Amino acid sequence: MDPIPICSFCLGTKESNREKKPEELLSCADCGSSGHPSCLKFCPELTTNVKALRWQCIECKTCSACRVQGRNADNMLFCDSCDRGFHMECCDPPLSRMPKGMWICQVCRPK
């Protein structure tokens, strides 16, 4: 769905983030909801990575490997490089422990 030109968190346009400063929105490819990266708390390089991809918001995000949410969707990991979501049991290899700190998905890792 086409982007909603308003940030879901601060209701500002791309012309006024929470600091009343211009900042382009990220927009969910599935539901069209948008957010300023500053409002989403994304770091700059995550932001520039997400801009080049088909991004889903937190609520729309399905696991990139198995393509479902499922009953334990709240514990799906988000890639610190690309914001893709992965269930623990769908990681490479499947994880039985929640990673502490930075985690990067299989899509972003080198071949």
Binding site: C10, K41, N75, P99, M102
Partner: peptide, 16 residues
């Protein structure tokens, strides 16, 4: 790692 839960709280709520 960031999860759907940590991200949702990290941002705070959507505007009502």
């Amino acid at each position: 790692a960031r999860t759907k839960q940590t991200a949702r709280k990290s941002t705070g709520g959507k505007a009502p």
